[PDB]
Amino acid sequence: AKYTREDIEKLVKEENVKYIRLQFTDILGTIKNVEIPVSQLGKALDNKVMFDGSSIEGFVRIEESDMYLYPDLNTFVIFPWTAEKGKVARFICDIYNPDGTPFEGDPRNNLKRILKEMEDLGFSDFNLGPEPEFFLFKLDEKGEPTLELNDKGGYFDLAPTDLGENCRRDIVLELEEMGFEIEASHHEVAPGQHEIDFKYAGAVRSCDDIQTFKLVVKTIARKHGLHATFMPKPLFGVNGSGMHCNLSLFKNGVNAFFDENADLQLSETAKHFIAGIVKHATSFTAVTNPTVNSYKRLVPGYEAPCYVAWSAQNRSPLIRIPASRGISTRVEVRSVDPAANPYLALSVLLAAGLDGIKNKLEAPAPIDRNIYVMSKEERMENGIVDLPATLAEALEEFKSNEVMVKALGEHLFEHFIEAKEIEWDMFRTQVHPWEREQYMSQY
Amino acid sequence: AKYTREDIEKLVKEENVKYIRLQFTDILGTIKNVEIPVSQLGKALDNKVMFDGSSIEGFVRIEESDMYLYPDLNTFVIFPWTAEKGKVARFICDIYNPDGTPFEGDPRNNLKRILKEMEDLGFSDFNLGPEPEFFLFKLDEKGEPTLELNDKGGYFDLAPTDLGENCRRDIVLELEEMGFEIEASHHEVAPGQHEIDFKYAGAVRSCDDIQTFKLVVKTIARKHGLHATFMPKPLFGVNGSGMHCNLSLFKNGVNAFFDENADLQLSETAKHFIAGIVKHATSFTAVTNPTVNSYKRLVPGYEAPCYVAWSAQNRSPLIRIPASRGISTRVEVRSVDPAANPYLALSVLLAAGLDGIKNKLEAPAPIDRNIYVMSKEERMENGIVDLPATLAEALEEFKSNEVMVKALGEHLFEHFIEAKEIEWDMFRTQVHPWEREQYMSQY
C-alpha cells in the first residue's frame, strides 16, 4: 500500500493537480484512458466513475457496456513535463462489472488470475526485468513522421552529444522524477534505435511501468520534434526492436531459480521453467508478437529469435540465462517484442513456465551450437523447431495449445483471436507496392 | 506438318526476312529467346544453333550448360508490325541435350510427356480454350508505367471508341495477320481490363499461342503508349485478372466429354475428369498460380475461385461446365491465371484429370448453392475445402501430392520449388508500407 486515500488527497492538493488521467489497457495492449477534472477525484477514489467497458476489446466492439474504474492508489503518478496551473496526474485503474465483480475481458486482471495461480504452487513473487527497444524518426514540415532516423549511432555508441537536446537522456531524466528505477540505457545496434532497461519488478507493477514507459517515451519524443515507435520491424534490412523479458521466480522471498551446487548454478525449478517455456514457445508467440510486422523481425541475421532453444552464450537464442547468479539468476526470453501487450505477454509466459514446474517437464539440452548455419536438416535431427513464420501460423498454434489458451481466459481469448484474424486477413488481401515492382512488368 | 523445310525457306526469302527469333519458355513461364540473322537460318533449321540451356531454370542458374534449339516448323510466324528491311520472324524451339536427347528441364517438353501419357489411355486430343485477361496502364513522361488505367469501361462495355487508336482492337487485328483464330474479345469487369478469347486448340499449340499472345499484347500496347500486364492482382479492391482454361478430352476424334443421355449431357469420362481435378485442385494451385500476388486475386468478392467445387451456374466456381454441348462440351477451370506458365499449368491440369479417369474417381455433387455466404462451418459440413491462401501454403500442398509432383518431373519440380521458396521468402521478410501505416504510430 504505497499510498493511501489521504496520502493521495494531500498530494493532489499540495502539488496543485488539476487533471487526472484514469488509465487502463485494452486487448491490443493499447494505452486507454478516461480523463476527469480534479474536482472529481473524490468520485474517482470511490470507484464510482463509469465508462464504456466495451472499449477494452478494441476495434471489435459490438455494444456499449457500462463499467467501473477502480484506481490503484499505488500507481498514482504525476507528469513533470505538464506544468503550471494544469498539472496532470494518473491512476492505472482496474475494471469491474456493474455488479462489483472484476471484468474478465481486462488483461491486467488476467495477469492477476495467473499470478494467483502462481501462489497456489508455493511461489511468492514473479519479477520481470524488461528491455524495451524503440526507434526515433524525424518529423516533417507538417508533423508527420518520416523514415529519417534521429542519428547514425551504433551498438552502445555515444549517440547525440549531450549538448542541446538528447531524447534518450531527457526520457530517463523524466522517468526518474516520476519514480522510475531505471537500470541503464544505451544506443542500439541499428541507427536511431534506443534502449532503456528497467529494474527488477513484480509482474503487475513491471507491466504497469512498461505501459507508462511507452507513454513517456512517445510524449517526450514528440516534444523534441521526433517520433518514437515500438513497431517490431519499422525498416527492412535494419535491426528490429524487441522487448527481452528477464523472468525470475521466488519462493518465501528467495530467488527460486538459483542453486549454488547444480550445473550453471540453476535449480531444478529453474530448468523445469525452461522446459515449460520451450514446450509452449511456438504456441504463445501469437501473444508475445501480436502484430503481422512482428514476424518480419523474427528473421535470421538481425539478432532476433528464430528457433526454440536456450543457451548461456549464443548468436541469438530464444531463451538466454544471464551471467549474474544468486538473487539475480534469471531466465531471459528474447522473442517478446515492444508491440506485445505486457499484461497478456506475461500471463502466457508465466503459464508456460508454471506448466513445466507443476508437471516437472524435462528441460532440453543447452545449445551453444550454431542454429544459424545448420540447415533445417540438423534442426530436425535435433529438437530444434522453428517459430511460426507468420501471424496466421502463430494463431493456429496458439489455439491448439490448451494451457496457453486457458492462460488468457474465455473472454480475452475469444476477442484476441477475432481481432488478429481480421488483422491478418486485412494484410493478406492487401496489394503491396513490392508486389507490382516484382510482377507489374515481369508478367 | 504445317510447314516444311522448303516452305520455310521460300517464305523467308519472298517475305524478305532479315531477323529470326528462336524463342522458348523457361521454368517461370517467361518468354525466352535467342535471336539470329537470316544468314543463319540454315544452321537453325539444321538444329545446330547452341545456347546456354541453364537459362531455362530462370534465376536459379548455377552453371552454364550448352544445349541445342530445335525449331518447330509449325510455329513459324512473321511479325507484321516489324516492317521494311528489318522484317522479323519467329520459331518456337524445343530444347535438346548435347547428346541429342530432349531436355527434362524444358516445360514445353513436359507437356509432351504428359500428353503421351494421355494417348496411352486411349485419348487422341486434349484441346484448350484460354480466356487470358490483362490490364492496360498509362505511361508517364519518361516511359515507366503508372497506376492510371487506359479507360473507365465496365464488363462488356464499348471501351475506347473506334476513332483514333484502340489497343484491344489493334491487338486482335495483328493476331489475325499472324494467323490467330480468335473467338472474340470484350472489356472486362474492372476499368482498364481487357480479355481476348482464343479458339479451341491442341494443348501444345494452344499453350504456344498463349506465350505469343502475351508478346503481341505487350508489344502492341507499348506501341500505343500503354503498358500491358498479366499480373493476377495489380490493384487492391478492383477485379483481378485470371486465365480460365476450357479443357476438353477427345477419343478417336470425338469429344469424349459429351453424352447425350446422361445428366447434364456429361459422360462418365467427363465426370471422372471432374473428380481428378477436384482431388488435386489444392495441390496444383502452386503451378496454376505461381506468384505471391496470384493469391491476392483468390480473395472472395471479385468473381475468382476460392473453394474447390464445380457447378454449371454459380457466383464464381472453381470448375464450370459451359452451356454448349456436343463437340463443345468442356470443363472450365477458373483458378488458373495469366501469370501461370502455360506449359506447366496444362501438364498439371492434364495429370489431375487423367488421374481421375484412370482410377475412375467419383465426382462430387454439383453445387448451385452459395459458398460465398455459408461460413466455413457448412463448408466443413460439406466437401468444400478452401484453396491455399498463400504461395507458401500452396507449395506445401503441391509437394505432398505425388501424382502432381510426378506430373512435372524430377528436374522441373526441383527447380520450380527452389525458385518459389526463395520468391516467397523474399516477400515474407519484406516490410511493406501498409505495415508502417498500421503500426508506425499505433505502437
Added chain:
Amino acid sequence: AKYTREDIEKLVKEENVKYIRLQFTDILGTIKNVEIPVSQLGKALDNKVMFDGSSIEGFVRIEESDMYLYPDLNTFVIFPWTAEKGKVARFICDIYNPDGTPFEGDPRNNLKRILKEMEDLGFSDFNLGPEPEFFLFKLDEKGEPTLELNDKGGYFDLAPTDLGENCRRDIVLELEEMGFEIEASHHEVAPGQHEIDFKYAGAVRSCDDIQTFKLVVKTIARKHGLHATFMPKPLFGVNGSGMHCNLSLFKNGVNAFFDENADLQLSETAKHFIAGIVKHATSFTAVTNPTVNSYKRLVPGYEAPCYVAWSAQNRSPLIRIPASRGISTRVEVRSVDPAANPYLALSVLLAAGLDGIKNKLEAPAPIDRNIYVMSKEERMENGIVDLPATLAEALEEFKSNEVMVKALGEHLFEHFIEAKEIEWDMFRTQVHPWEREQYMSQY
C-alpha cells in the same frame, strides 16, 4: 591518486549531477558508453553495473556476452555545457569479465599491458603529446554535413575573427573548464582545418584525453551548426589530417632520451628507440592508419609521411625530433592520424620502441635531404622504404610482424584483422563515380 569514492560522492551531490556516462572504447577506437541515472551511481562505483561486452568488437560482434564496467575514479569529469537541470558526468571505465578478470579484448587494457613490459625493462613513464587535426564543415538544412568548409583560413592564420561564434576558441575554452591542459592551438594548412595540441601526459591519461577531445570537439561543433571530422583525408587535393604523436620515454623520472653531451643531444636509449620504430614502421602502419581513407592521406605533396626515415629538419619525415631538449626531448611519429584508436596506436608504437631498446638496435643515418625528388630507384640505394600504399598492404605487413601482433594480443589482433579485412573488401568491390567518369564513355 586524484579522487576518492567520497570525493566523487560529494562532487556529484554538490554539482547536482543527474546523468552519468560510463564510457569506454571499442576496437575501432569508437567512443562508446552505457548511461545510467545518478541514482545508480553507487552500483556504478561498486563495479556491479553490467553490459554486453561484445560491443567492444564493433560490427564484428557475434554473440552477446555479459561483462562488468570498472569506473576509473580519476577519469571523472563534468561536462560544463550540459544544462544545470540535467548535469552530465562521465567515467572512463575498464572492462572486466564476469569472474572479475580484465577482459583481454579491451583496448585500454592492452595499453596497460604493454606499459608493464615498459616498467619491467626499467622505465617509469611514457608520455604522449598528440597534435590532433580536424576539419569543420557546414551543416545544411537537415543538420546534414556538406563539403562546405567553415573558413578560408591558412596555416597559422588568425582564422575566424573574435566574432560572436568561433568554434576553435570555444572548444579550447570548454576544455579549460573540464581540467584540460592545452598547449596551444592554431589553424592548419588547409582551409577549415584546425589543430589543438595538448600538454604531454601519461600514455593512458593522454589516450583518454584523445578520446574525450574527439567527443567535446564534435559536440561543440554541432552546437555551432558545424560538423567536426577526424577523417584522415576528407577532400582530394587538399591537405589531410594527422594526429602527430610526440613520444617521450622516462626512466627514474628523468627524460631517458636527452643526453647533455651527446651527438644531437640524444642519448643511446633515444637512438635505439628510433631504430625500434624504423624497422616496425611499415608493420604497425595498419594500426596508426586503420582506415582505407587513411592511405589516401599518406601521399606525397601534403606534409604526410610516405617513407620510413627520421630527421630534425625535412619536408615530411616519418620520424621528426623537435628542437627543445631536456625533459622536453621527444620523438615525433607523424604517420599516425586522428582515426587511429589511441589505445591501440600507443600500444603498437610503445611495443616497437621497446623492441629497439631491449635488442640494442642501431639507428640508421638521418635523412636530411629531399626524399621527394629521389626516384623510386634512388630511395632503394639508401635505407628508404615506402609505407604501405593501401590498407590491404598495411594489413599483410602487420601479420608478417610478430612483435607487433603480440603487441595487440591474440584476441584483439584476431578481431582487428577481421574488421579491417571485411572493411577493405567492401571498398575493393565498390564502384566509384570516378571509375564511371573515366570509363563510361572512353570504353
